[PDB]
Design a protein around this ligand. Structure first.
Ligand code: SF4
Ligand code: SF4
Ligand code: F3S
Ligand SMILES: [Fe+3]
Ligand SMILES: [Mg+2]
Ligand code: NI
Lengths: 261, 543
């Protein structure tokens, strides 16, 4: 309408991505919400509850002029999608509905994009990504959770300028274009073969590379070192290796987080 | 006071402004709730997903049980493996781990009060009716003197909201129970305007609070600085970061005091009738901010925010926690039969869904019971236990509150109580930041040791205890083959919002819901008020 309408869905998730969205500055959450978009459904912060919340949802999707769909969390597929329910309906059923007439679909977090932690072996709920589940191309903003800078960025850009340049796994190239390791301020140690053998060792106190401790920054695509989190830090700067969280199925692909294989 | 004659069932699904998926189903007799059911709607796995994996990886998987409660699960898990592994983390690790948790308490309770609970007592639309000059005077009479509570500041808030509303695109306010007036909403427009100005303020303050946490924790949400044996963030031990940390923290504390607490007390004054609605008997706390985090026993005993189990509402007998007494049933839960009464070390997670509104099986959360009884965990439990023990800080603050409110203390046993407790301890964690920070700034500067050396056992078992913003959190592990044989989490929200035990006994939330007055069954704000006071986190609860 006067402000574009965004419908936000929560499925198999931890809410770490709604929390990351609100960590955004440039613009701050309220600004984005009052001035830019029209967040019409978002269970975590919406005032109405129960039937009233579903009426609100209905209204949004029936909106005289479209909506953009933001999906958080993967979809519980086992037992007809009944292991994940909202308003007495299965989560799959409802993303199916919302995605149907959605002007666009943005998957916030590694979970929605690629199935997530619930999809990690042995995957008891048989969860899957919004894409794998619906069978539609989605704009993935992976991460556990993603940098608000990347989310808000993609949202805005999708509302203004249109769909951004995506890589092979659907991630806007703008943010998921360079390897974490390539911008990592510890690269000189990695090249110099100066590795930290333990978190208690002098090398670790000295800031030596964390490859030996299992840093996946070398195979991870994200803007964490360049952009930082909360305008203040990021894992490797906190002396801890990157878990490769912006990567598909990372829970099983990066598994022994403290080992290189 | 306001109450309908409504007889019949009401169900609120989804319960919004909480974390996770919760369906609440109550039976109402003449406008008062006579029975309740707490139905958790999503199952992920976690405990199952962790079986057979490397103990060092657990903290990373479990931290994903929740993104609101961030870090606490990585902490609880780190403490758990430190136990099975038998490592005594260094002094600075304890200080840094405890400091990040304080930062978490800060961010968590601010957001919960404003963004999650507030909408249950405040009518944002009535903030449009208040005159800013009259509002500012009241703000000037009830709160700390702040430029933010000015006539012009309040006015701009009112002008922003007004425009928005007059845009017709209400957004999150769409269908709000307070649209049109609601007999349950008592606050005068002036206080609705003040609260709404502070609501928007807290959206910015919470960013700043999560930024302080990220200095020490690597980043927020989902800290990346703890490791088996201690932490890895050697820079968090330094002069500039610590200085900055101290700065942001200070700025978050000014809001807690000028806005948060005053607002809380303001809302509480108008709704004193809630000091008698939704109370429980039993309270449990594993405690937090310990001075000797070298073992669970040493945690329970040395916690600045103390341990205890209050039964009945006997505040004269705060017993000690017997970790062997803790257990969880699965009778009314969506799990296979046969597993009722398991102690965490022997926990069993066998999901077996039935149907919606089964009554015999209605939740994915298990029912954690102590020595046969339900326990309320969280801010009210902490406050009660801490107070009962003569914890100085708690005495001062609780009495300052009991006084300004002119209510007993027996009055805390309620939704009003639970709500205030969350604020009371925010004021106390804020009261301790400078002190705690100086200790670590000084220790780090002298010796930066952050991680101890340790070794992986073939077989072992351990438990990580912590009192997160919502209550009693414990992670239990059984290492076998140098791998995960069993990893079980018993989370705060599982205690408060799980279903009935095998004795058919209600959980804290189901018990607190009985006697809840419904002024208007079509817009049941009262149900939400009690439910949100517990600060439900369904992801945390079910995992
Ligand atoms: S991607 Fe991560 S932070 Fe986001 S909802 Fe999933 S587990 Fe949580
Ligand atoms: S610390 Fe990690 S991301 Fe950085 S240089 Fe080393 S391997 Fe690369
Ligand atoms: S763990 Fe994730 S947040 Fe960045 S530093 Fe690594 S891709
Ligand atoms: Fe929690
Ligand atoms: Mg459990
Ligand atoms: Ni949580």
């Amino acid at each position: 309408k006067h402000r574009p309408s965004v419908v936000w869905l929560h499925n198999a998730e931890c809410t770490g991505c709604t929390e990351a969205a609100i960590r955004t500055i440039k613009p701050y959450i309220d600004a984005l919400i009052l001035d830019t978009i029209s967040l019409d459904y978002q269970e975590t912060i919406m005032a109405a509850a129960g039937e009233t919340s579903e009426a609100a949802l209905h209204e949004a999707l029936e909106g005289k002029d479209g909506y953009y769909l933001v999906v958080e969390g993967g979809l519980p597929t086992i037992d007809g999608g009944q292991w994940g329910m909202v308003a007495g309906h299965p989560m799959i059923e409802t993303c199916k509905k919302a995605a149907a007439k959605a002007k666009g679909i943005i998957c916030i977090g590694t979970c929605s994009p690629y199935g997530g932690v619930q999809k990690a072996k042995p995957n008891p709920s048989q969860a899957k990504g919004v894409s794998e589940a619906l069978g539609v191309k989605t704009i993935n903003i992976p991460g556990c959770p993603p940098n608000p800078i990347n989310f808000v960025g993609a949202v805005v850009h999708v509302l203004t300028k249109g769909i951004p340049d995506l890589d092979e796994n659907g991630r806007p190239k703008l943010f998921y274009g360079e390897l974490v390791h390539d911008n990592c301020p510890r690269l000189p140690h990695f090249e110099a073969s100066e590795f930290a053998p333990s978190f208690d060792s002098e090398e670790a106190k000295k800031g030596f590379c964390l490859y030996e401790l299992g840093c996946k920054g070398p195979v991870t695509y994200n803007n964490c070192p360049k952009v930082l989190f909360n305008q203040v830090n990021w894992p490797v700067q906190a002396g801890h290796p990157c878990l490769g969280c912006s990567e598909p199925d990372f829970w099983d692909t990066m598994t022994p987080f403290y080992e290189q294989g | 006071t306001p109450q309908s004659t409504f007889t019949g069932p009401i169900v609120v699904d989804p319960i919004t402004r909480i974390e996770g998926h919760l369906r609440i189903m109550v039976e109402v007799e003449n406008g008062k709730v006579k029975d309740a059911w707490s139905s958790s709607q999503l199952f992920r796995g976690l405990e199952i997903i962790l079986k057979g994996r490397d103990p060092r990886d657990a903290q990373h998987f479990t931290q994903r049980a929740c993104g609101v409660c961030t870090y606490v699960h990585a902490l609880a898990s780190s403490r758990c493996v430190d136990d099975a592994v038998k490592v005594s983390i260094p002094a600075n690790a304890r200080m840094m781990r405890n400091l990040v948790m304080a930062s978490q308490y800060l961010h968590d309770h601010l957001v919960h009060f404003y963004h999650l609970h507030a909408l249950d007592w405040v009518d944002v639309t009535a903030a449009l009716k208040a005159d800013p000059n009259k509002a500012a005077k009241l703000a000037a009479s009830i709160d700390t003197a702040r430029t933010g509570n000015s006539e012009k500041a309040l006015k701009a808030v009112q002008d922003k909201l007004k425009a928005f509303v007059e845009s017709g695109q209400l957004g999150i306010f769409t269908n709000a129970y307070f649209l049109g007036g609601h007999k349950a909403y008592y606050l005068p427009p002036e206080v609705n305007l003040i609260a709404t100005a502070h609501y928007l303020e807290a959206l910015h303050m919470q960013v700043k609070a999560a930024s302080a946490m990220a200095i020490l924790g690597g980043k927020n949400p989902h800290t990346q600085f703890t490791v088996v044996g201690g932490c890895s963030n050697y820079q968090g031990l330094t002069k500039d970061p610590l200085a900055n940390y101290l700065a942001l923290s200070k700025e978050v504390c000014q809001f807690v005091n000028e806005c948060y607490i005053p607002d809380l007390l303001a809302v509480a004054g108008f709704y004193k009738d809630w000091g008698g609605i939704g109370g429980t008997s039993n309270y449990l706390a594993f405690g937090e901010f310990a001075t000797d985090d070298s073992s669970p026993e040493k945690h329970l005993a040395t916690s600045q925010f103390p341990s205890g189990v209050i039964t009945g509402r006997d505040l004269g007998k705060v017993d000690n926690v017997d970790l062997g007494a803790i257990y969880e049933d699965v009778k009314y839960s969506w799990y296979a039969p046969g597993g009722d009464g398991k102690h965490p070390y022997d926990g069993v997670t066998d999901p077996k869904y039935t149907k919606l509104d089964d009554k015999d099986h209605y939740s994915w959360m298990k029912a954690p019971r102590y020595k046969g009884k339900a326990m309320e965990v969280g801010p009210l439990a902490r406050t009660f236990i801490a107070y009962a023990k003569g914890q100085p800080d708690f005495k001062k603050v609780v009495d300052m509150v009991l006084g300004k409110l002119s209510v007993p203390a027996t009055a805390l046993h309620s939704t009003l109580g639970r709500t205030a407790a969350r604020g009371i301890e925010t004021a106390i964690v804020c009261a301790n930041m400078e002190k705690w920070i100086k200790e670590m700034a000084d220790s780090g500067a002298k010796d930066n040791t952050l991680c101890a050396k340790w070794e992986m056992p073939e077989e072992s078992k351990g438990v990580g205890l912590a009192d997160a913003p919502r209550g009693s959190l414990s992670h239990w592990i059984r290492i076998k083959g140098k791998k995960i044989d069993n990893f079980q989490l018993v989370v705060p929200s599982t205690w408060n919002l799980g279903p009935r035990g095998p004795q058919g006994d209600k959980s804290p939330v189901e018990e607190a819901l009985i006697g809840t007055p419904i002024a208007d069954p079509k817009r049941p704000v009262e149900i939400l008020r009690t439910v949100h006071a517990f600060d439900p986190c369904i992801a945390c609860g079910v995992h």
